[PDB]
Design a protein around this ligand. Structure first.
Ligand code: PNM
Length: 640
């Protein structure tokens, strides 16, 4: 029995080499090719495993219940159960047999064909048939398509039917001007190594009406992924790309001929959208007659996925950004339905999934405005909109008297001389400032003084009631919002700067809409929701209902008062409660400071909608407030 455990070592090493993909090392562990030993030579074992297991994409061989006994003086039979993963799913409970051999001191395996699959007999063969699964669709809250599959018109040229000289140059220029293409692009496409003169060289996926086709230009219909909104929802939806051999090596249940989501919801929901491949993996005898069916099941097309997004609101929010750096989040704050998740600038997902140029992708990747960023999921300093939270906390703990009038002289203020040359600044030199005036003019000095009077302890008690440090249950990659880098400010300056939303605060636009939902639910925070069929989740008693009834009327004056920072929104004539903001960041590139514009707004009458828009590294005189009129009209009209 001292050699039985040595044989179990070799059997465990044999299945480990098969599991590791090292078919040569597993073939070295066999004995001699005889009549009652190995049924094939060593190099022939490498080929049989590499051909069969490679055809079925066998990966992850796991064994169980190993029993090594004694049959003769030189024969030690063994048996075990095993399972493996193939391109058609998991192949379970496979009963393997065989024998072992040990002549001198080394123990080897008597290789037999049944060590590839249980029922193999000599010249038996393996067949695999597969059928691709159609990818599921991504639809909005009203069934409108966001990521679907349709017929695409592919433009291409046959180098033979172009010409020989001069006529070929003229026909290239005719196609170049008829479809907005570079003459260097056509000549570089038809001059690649794969191009034959009679081949169809694809050029561009045209989306509009088909123009007049010059000589050599033909258009073929191909089926592929299509995004009706395009740039307007590229960061959220994402794109699909060709599946590589490395993707198959990681997950053999993928379709080697299909597409895989590379970013956005296409990647986050890739398993539900891609479905399962159908087909049959069978063993045949030498005659090709089906012997045993190992795996067989029919194709299951991918599921559709309905989002809370409004396709009309998504396009309106994105176009309102005018192609500048920024983002916009629109919700129904009583339920959390994310109506829009726009990010700008953006990339073309249709061009991305239909083959993109190396320089076109380089332009996206090296654009300093970085269109690949999902800005609705990137943490920012919230700015002056965060004063709503600081005021609500000060009202709940009794620190802020809504009618107490602070006397503030000038535009700069500091606690005492220990602050050095640093001072909190404001923009409006208003002498008599209470809570309402502080919100109308957005007074940092008022909030900084109220935050310092409140103290870090009471401030964090109110802050910890929100969603700082929480992972939102959303299919979007994001980091939790943070109050500061550490659990303590350890600085009166940092405490005051946090008071008006300008410390180490990092809150992405989606998390901001979650925190700000308390002003539309009487102090109840409603978590955002992207999947339509999801259940509404909320947190009770985040802030007091009294604070809501005090701040929201003041937020109406931010729009209605003639000196309110959002007074331009009064032109709409709709019930609006808003709060603006402008944060300052230090971008060491140009060294001159950069500014982020912010806007929070919702309907205080029906609580039907709520939006949080922002501009990153805004241009002078540009703001989110001057861009929200069109989106506010649509949300007020359709969401009450
Ligand atoms: C909140 O964001 C506040 N911002 C500042 O104090 C910084 C700042 C940035 C640019 C110019 C001047 C001051 C206040 N709220 C913003 C706003 O609501 O847009 C103001 C610019 C009114 S100051």
């Amino acid at each position: 029995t001292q050699a039985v455990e040595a044989g179990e070592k070799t059997v465990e090493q044999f299945v480990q080499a098969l599991n590791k993909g090292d078919y040569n090392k597993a073939a070295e562990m066999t004995s001699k090719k005889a009549a009652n030993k190995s049924a094939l030579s060593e190099k022939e074992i490498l080929d049989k495993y590499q051909n069969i297991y490679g055809a079925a994409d066998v990966k992850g061989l796991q064994i169980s219940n190993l029993k090594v006994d004694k049959k003769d003086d030189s024969t030690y039979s063994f048996s075990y159960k095993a399972k493996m993963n193939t391109s058609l799913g998991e192949l379970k409970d496979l009963s393997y047999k065989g024998t072992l051999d040990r002549n001198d001191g080394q123990t080897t395996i008597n290789w037999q064909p049944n060590l590839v699959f249980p029922e193999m007999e000599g010249n038996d063969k393996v067949s695999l048939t597969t059928q691709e699964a159609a990818r599921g669709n991504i639809i909005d809250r009203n069934g409108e398509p966001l990521a679907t599959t349709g017929k695409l018109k592919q433009l291409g040229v046959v180098p033979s039917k172009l010409g020989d000289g001069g006529e070929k140059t003229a026909n290239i220029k005719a196609i170049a001007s008829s479809f907005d293409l570079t003459e260097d692009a056509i000549n570089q496409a038809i001059s690649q190594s794969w191009v034959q003169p009679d081949y169809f060289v694809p050029l561009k996926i045209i989306d509009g009406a088909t123009p007049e086709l010059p000589a050599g230009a033909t258009i073929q219909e191909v089926d592929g992924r299509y995004y009706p909104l395009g740039e307007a929802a590229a960061q959220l939806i994402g794109y699909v790309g060709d599946i590589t051999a490395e993707d198959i090596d990681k997950n053999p249940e993928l379709s080697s001929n299909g597409k895989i989501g590379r970013s956005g919801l296409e990647m986050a929901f890739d398993k539900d959208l891609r479905g399962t491949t159908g087909g049959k993996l069978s063993i045949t005898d030498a005659d090709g007659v089906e012997k045993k069916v190992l795996i067989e099941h029919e194709v299951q097309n991918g599921k559709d996925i309905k989002l809370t997004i409004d396709a009309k609101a998504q396009k309106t929010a994105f176009d309102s950004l005018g192609g500048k750096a920024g983002s916009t989040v629109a919700t129904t704050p009583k339920t959390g339905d994310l109506l829009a998740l726009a990010s700008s600038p953006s990339y073309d997902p249709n061009k991305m999934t239909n083959g993109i140029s190396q320089e076109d992708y380089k332009a996206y990747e090296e654009n300093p405005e970085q269109p690949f960023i999902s800005r609705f999921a990137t943490g920012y300093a919230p700015g002056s909109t965060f004063k709503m939270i600081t005021a609500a906390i000060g009202l709940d703990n009794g620190t802020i008297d809504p009618n107490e009038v602070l006397t503030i002289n000038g535009l700069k203020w500091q606690k005492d001389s220990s602050w050095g040359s640093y001072q909190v600044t404001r923009v409006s030199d208003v002498s008599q400032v209470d809570l309402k005036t502080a919100l109308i003019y957005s007074d940092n000095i008022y909030m900084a003084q109220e935050t310092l009077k409140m103290g870090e302890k009471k401030f964090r008690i109110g802050l910890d009631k929100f969603i700082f440090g929480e992972d939102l249950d959303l299919p979007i990659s994001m980091n939790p919002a943070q109050i500061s880098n550490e659990d303590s400010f350890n600085s009166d300056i940092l405490l005051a700067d946090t008071g008006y939303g300008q410390g180490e605060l990092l809150i992405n636009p989606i998390q901001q809409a979650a925190m700000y939902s308390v002003f539309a639910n009487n102090g109840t925070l409603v978590y955002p929701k992207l999947i339509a069929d999801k259940e509404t989740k909320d947190k009770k008693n985040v802030i007091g209902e009294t604070a809501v009834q005090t701040i929201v009327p003041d937020l109406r004056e931010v729009v209605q008062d003639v000196n309110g920072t959002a007074h331009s929104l009064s032109a709409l004539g709709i019930p609006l409660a808003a709060k603006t903001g402008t944060a300052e960041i230090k971008e060491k590139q140009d060294e001159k400071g950069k500014e982020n514009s912010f806007l929070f707004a919702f309907n205080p009458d029906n609580q039907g909608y709520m939006m949080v828009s922002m501009l990153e590294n805004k241009e002078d005189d540009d703001s989110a407030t001057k861009r929200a009129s069109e989106l506010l009209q649509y949300l007020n009209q359709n969401y009450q």
